[PDB]
């Protein structure tokens, strides 16, 4: 397991989705991702997790109407082709069908600031974007009271890793309590299913396992 992978759930990180730890050990050949991509602010994101205490997950409550949400890939095999455990891959539900302008708002009910992660998909070919998300301009915008940014796919071939020319890029935010993150997208968007909550921000309500040290080690455990 790569550490960042605990947040979004590749098959690797299946055991450690809701782990509780005083000491966290990263390992060298670990891969944060099943389908090739990289986290924005990656090194900064891990340092958060190492000292988290572990993480608790709860569903963001999103529901969908007319879309394929069950997107699967050769990259996330898991008995049969699959995806990130904690996200949904959204597709047109009929090939080459232009994707719906949709909006989502999720609001941070809990006292601890939530961790939210989302994806932008850069399709293997200009064709594949079309097949997947329909045709025309693609825009994704993420809005929070402290955060707003807009993302667009830049579709092309890239060197084949894990058998995929396509890439998924993850962007994350910290959401204060009582704050709404608004998700608006016409496609190419990988959606959070679950919010990540640190355990050292818990109220001593027995999830709470405070203040871990994350190390990098080649040694066994004892």
């Amino acid at each position, epitope marked *: 397991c790569g550490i960042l992978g605990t947040i979004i759930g590749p098959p690797q990180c299946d055991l450690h989705l809701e782990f509780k730890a005083d000491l966290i050990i990263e390992r060298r050949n670990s891969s944060d991702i099943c389908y*090739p*991509g990289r986290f924005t602010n990656e090194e900064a994101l891990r340092q958060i997790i190492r000292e988290s205490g572990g993480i608790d997950k709860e569903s963001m409550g999103f529901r969908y109407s007319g879309i394929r949400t069950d997107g699967a890939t050769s990259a996330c095999k898991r008995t049969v082709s699959s995806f990130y455990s904690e996200m949904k891959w959204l597709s047109s539900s009929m090939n080459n069908q232009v994707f719906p302008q949709l909006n989502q708002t999720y609001r941070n009910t809990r006292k601890e600031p939530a961790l939210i992660v989302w994806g932008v998909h850069h399709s293997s070919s200009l064709d594949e974007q079309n097949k997947l998300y329909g045709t025309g301009n693609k825009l994704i915008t993420v809005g929070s009271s402290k955060y707003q940014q807009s993302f667009s796919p830049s579709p*092309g071939a*890239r*060197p084949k890793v894990n058998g995929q020319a396509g890439r998924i890029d993850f962007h994350w935010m910290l959401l204060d309590p009582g704050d709404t993150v608004t998700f608006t997208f016409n496609g190419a968007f990988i959606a959070p299913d679950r919010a990540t909550f640190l355990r050292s921000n818990a109220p001593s309500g027995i999830e709470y396992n405070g203040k871990s040290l994350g190390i990098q080690s080649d040694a066994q455990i004892d």
Partner: antibody
Amino acid sequence: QVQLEESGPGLVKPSETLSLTCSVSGVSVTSDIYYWTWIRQPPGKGLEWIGYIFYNGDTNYNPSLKSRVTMSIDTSKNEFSLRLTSVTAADTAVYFCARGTEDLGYCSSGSCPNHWGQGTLVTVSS
Amino acid sequence: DIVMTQSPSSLSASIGDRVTITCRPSQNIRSFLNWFQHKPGKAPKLLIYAASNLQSGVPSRFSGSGSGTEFTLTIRSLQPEDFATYYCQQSYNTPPTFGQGTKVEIKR
């Protein structure tokens, strides 16, 4: 998904300027994520990376050559080019143009050319 | 400025044989290592990217392994069309640098 055809003189006299062009087919040289690279191989020697250029203007040239080399992208002709000044016999080589895709999860910026042309020989001689 | 030491410089092997080429960079480069194939008069071709990822059109008899300071290209059952010069290439810092190459010749 892209084709890359190199062109240029073939013979350049010592101390003169070497110019090469790469005709690109199948993609546009105006794309935000690709970079365009030159590499060379002297007869019987190793491959030597020359540099990369992005449409946005970002470039990086091998320090062995940086004070003599420039590259440019011609958007109108869908081409990119190499210019190498004050050549000597050490610059006789097969010159390859290549495309790569920015991929900072797996590669330094501009450092993984993955679609190459077949190369064109340049001989520096009087 | 990272020096790539490839070995052997040349080898000969029979059709169907398993061939192994090693690359040792002068410093640890994690997985930022690519393998190229160069057949006479054709464009050099990226075979393996990021130490182990097979490129489109490359036969599965080709495999890359290793990380850090030792990398291996294996060709598991040599075919006549695999006659070529193979190069490793580090993508870890600028300038990208190449191994001096391994010429693979076929015994028949």
